[PDB]
User: Which sequence fits this backbone?
């Protein structure tokens, strides 16, 4: 079925017009993830599922990136606490750590830093809208360095399987020529085990990115 799973694999291809990008990633959850309590896309977050993840990324037109990530949710007598660590190597070595807390149930705030330098902050929320099968998710991100970059994403879970969303980011300070990024995103779980999706992303200072993705749970 896929409503209880411990692994998720995900693939994604993208074309960037101003070229090719591919990403495969694997996730292992330390505990069974129960996806029947809200939108299926956010089941790991909703059950505070610790895990480790590996990924590979390809860019052609030429560049390969391998990465590993872990997240830890740790209940305490006060608030649930959260830490993350990741590392990426590109053929270029970057890492990130974060610590934070669930200030209210399903609301995560996390601060951290990353380097080869920047402090980061982020928040995540996922709530059911009371009296229906809909839900909403928000994520916001700040990266604070010489200058700052910011971003947000919103997802409308119009049913537990279907989501449509949008995102925005200001990146003048990432030192490509690009100033603003916006996107729309769609995802649908055909079964709790299988989801496919689409992404359309524009950037300016020019550029567009069309993308399809898929994911399998077991």
Assistant:
């Amino acid at each position: 079925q896929g409503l209880e799973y411990q692994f998720e694999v995900q693939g994604q291809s993208e074309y960037v017009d101003t070229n090719f990008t591919g990403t495969a990633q694997g996730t292992y959850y330390f505990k069974n993830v129960d996806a029947s309590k809200g939108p299926l896309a956010e089941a790991a977050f909703l059950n505070q599922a610790s895990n480790v993840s590996v990924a590979y990324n390809y860019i052609k037109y030429e560049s390969h990136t391998y990465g590993v990530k872990g997240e830890a949710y740790l209940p305490t007598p006060y608030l649930p606490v959260y830490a993350s660590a990741s590392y990426n190597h590109t053929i270029g070595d970057r890492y990130a750590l974060e610590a934070g807390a669930m200030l209210l149930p399903n609301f995560l705030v996390a601060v951290g830093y990353t380097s080869v330098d920047a402090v980061t902050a982020r928040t995540k929320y996922v709530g059911n809208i009371d009296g229906t099968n809909m839900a909403i998710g928000f994520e916001a991100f700040g990266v604070f360095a010489e200058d700052n970059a910011y971003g947000m994403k919103t997802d409308l879970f119009v049913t537990p399987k279907l989501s449509v969303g949008a995102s925005f980011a200001d990146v003048s300070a990432f030192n490509s020529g690009y100033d603003h990024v916006w996107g729309g995103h769609t995802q649908y779980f055909i079964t709790p085990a299988v989801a496919v999706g689409a992404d359309f992303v524009k950037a300016n200072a020019d550029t567009q990115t069309i993308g399809l993705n898929a994911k399998f749970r077991f």
